[PDB]
Design a protein around this ligand. Structure first.
Ligand SMILES: CC(C)CN(C[C@@H](O)[C@H](Cc1ccccc1)NC(=O)O[C@H]1CO[C@H]2OCC[C@H]21)S(=O)(=O)c1ccc(N)cc1
Ligand SMILES: [Cl-]
Ligand SMILES: [Cl-]
Ligand SMILES: [Cl-]
Ligand SMILES: [Cl-]
Ligand SMILES: [Cl-]
Ligand SMILES: [Cl-]
Ligand SMILES: [Cl-]
Ligand SMILES: [Cl-]
Ligand code: NA
Ligand SMILES: [Zn+2]
Ligand SMILES: [Zn+2]
Ligand SMILES: [Zn+2]
Ligand SMILES: [Zn+2]
Ligand SMILES: [Zn+2]
Ligand SMILES: [Zn+2]
Ligand SMILES: [Zn+2]
Ligand SMILES: [Zn+2]
Ligand SMILES: [Zn+2]
Lengths: 99, 99
């Protein structure tokens, strides 16, 4: 698939079966999702964005389905205004930025 | 050129001739840089992300040299923690995000 970036590169995904809208974000190291409930097996993490820092819940080895692929990856849940798949997932998917 | 996303995609750009390192960010609609003064002809705007919001100043038709290309583009200035070249610049350069 190819994203020409005239529109946001947004897609739908499942995270442990939970449907989400996510932004493919080359500017993010991590993948941050709001709203989904992945349970109590997490570790707290601190994530910094353009405005400051948030606490997140880090879940390892989470099943994610996106772009017709299935991978395992780390998801952090917390208060992001847009759900983002960062480079930890983009690399698992084999994505690249090209010119 | 290809950015494989194992590392942050950061390159050196020249904005009105001054060198800045910038992050090539598909998750950003627009571009925001710190530490460079672009003057009194702007439109104030607020942008939001993780951690909250920041005040910015939006400048039009700014000279940018990056990835051996020269373009004229919209740039915001503000107290951003990292310099971001968002989709308005990536599309001017003809960049794409591919799987
Ligand atoms: C959260 C996204 C919807 C929007 N952001 C772009 C995003 O790529 C930022 C860009 C970014 C990068 C570093 C620092 C601040 C912001 N990355 C980010 O917040 O990533 C966080 C998750 O992974 C971690 O790795 C980097 C910071 C953490 S943003 O910086 O808030 C932003 C919003 C609007 C514009 N026009 C430009 C930038
Ligand atoms: Cl597009
Ligand atoms: Cl489009
Ligand atoms: Cl499913
Ligand atoms: Cl990281
Ligand atoms: Cl941490
Ligand atoms: Cl960690
Ligand atoms: Cl972080
Ligand atoms: Cl391909
Ligand atoms: Na003016
Ligand atoms: Zn398009
Ligand atoms: Zn499934
Ligand atoms: Zn949407
Ligand atoms: Zn991180
Ligand atoms: Zn992080
Ligand atoms: Zn971790
Ligand atoms: Zn030059
Ligand atoms: Zn400051
Ligand atoms: Zn392919």
């Amino acid at each position: 698939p190819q994203f020409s970036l005239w529109k946001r590169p947004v897609v739908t995904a499942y995270i442990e079966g939970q449907p989400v809208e996510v932004l493919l974000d080359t500017g993010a190291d991590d993948s941050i999702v709001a709203g989904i409930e992945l349970g109590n097996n997490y570790s707290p993490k601190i994530v910094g964005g353009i405005g400051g820092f948030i606490n997140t819940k880090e879940y390892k080895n989470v099943e994610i389905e996106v772009l017709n692929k299935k991978v395992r990856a780390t998801i952090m849940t917390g208060d992001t205004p847009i759900n983002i798949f960062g480079r930890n997932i983009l690399t698992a998917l084999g994505m690249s930025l090209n010119l």
